[PDB]
Amino acid sequence: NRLLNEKVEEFKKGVLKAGWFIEKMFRNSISSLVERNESLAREVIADEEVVDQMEVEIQEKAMEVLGLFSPIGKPLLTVTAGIRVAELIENIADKCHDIAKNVLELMEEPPLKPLEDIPAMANQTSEMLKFALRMFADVNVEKSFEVCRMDSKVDDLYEKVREELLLYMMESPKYVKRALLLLEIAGNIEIIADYATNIVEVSVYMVQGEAYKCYHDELLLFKKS
Ligand SMILES: O=[P-]([O-])[O-]
Numbered sequence: 124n125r126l127l128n129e130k131v132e133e134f135k136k137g138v139l140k141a142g143w144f145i146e147k148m149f150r151n152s153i154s155s156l157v158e159r160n161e162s163l164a165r166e167v168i169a170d171e172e173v174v175d176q177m178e179v180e181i182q183e184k185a186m187e188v189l190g191l192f193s194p195i196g197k198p199l200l201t202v203t204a205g206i207r208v209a210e211l212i213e214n215i216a217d218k219c220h221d222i223a224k225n226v227l228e229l230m231e232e233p234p235l236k237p238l239e240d241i242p243a244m245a246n247q248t249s250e251m252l253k254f255a256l257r258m259f260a261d262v263n264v265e266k267s268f269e270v271c272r273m274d275s276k277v278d279d280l281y282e283k284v285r286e287e288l289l290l291y292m293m294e295s296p297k298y299v300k301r302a303l304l305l306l307e308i309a310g311n312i313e314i315i316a317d318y319a320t321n322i323v324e325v326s327v328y329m330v331q332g333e334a335y336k337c338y339h340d341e342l343l344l345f346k347k348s
Pocket residue numbers: 175217
């Protein structure tokens with residue numbers, strides 16, 4: 124009668140497992156950079172196609188649940204929220220794939236410099252990813268606010284890294300390619316962090332049936348015309 128609940132809970136756990144999968148992908152992409160591990164980068168590139176599949180499966184299951192049970196209210200919100208989260212997860216995987224591509228290219232020549240700010244960007248981003256997936260599993264609107272502040276740390280680091288790498292590019296032509304490849308990695312981390320904030324926003328909607336958005340440190344009701 125309400126084995127609707129069994130199927131919705133399984134759908135949600137599928138989405139969360141694909142989440143835990145990209146959480147590991149992002150970890151592995153940044154590890155391929157710091158350890159200069161060609162194989163690990165190649166695994167991330169391969170794993171991107173696994174996540175394309177996961178998106179297809181999530182979408183299939185959402186249709187099965189919607190089409191058989193025709194849910195309303197909370198279960199309907201959860202399923203549509205799952206549809207949206209699975210695209211965010213797939214896109215995060217695209218960005219991890221692109222970081223890994225950059226790692227392979229970086230490995231063609233010697234290390235440019237010590238890595239501090241990029242590892243720190245990644246660390247903050249992986250905290251945000253973990254937190255987003257935990258909000259999707261069990262939403263706390265009062266605490267979900269914290270993701271926005273976390274993102275501001277990633278934005279500030281990105282700006283620093285961008286300025287520093289521009290200086291390296293200008294110092295010598297031999298620094299240019301590595302500095303660009305590193306800058307592009309930083310940019311991909313910054314976007315992944317944005318996606319983590321979007322997972323929190325969608326998770327809040329999933330309970331509220333009303334749109335919230337990060338506005339720099341503040342999670343507000345979508346304040347627009
Ligand atoms: O598989 P494509 O959306 O990156």
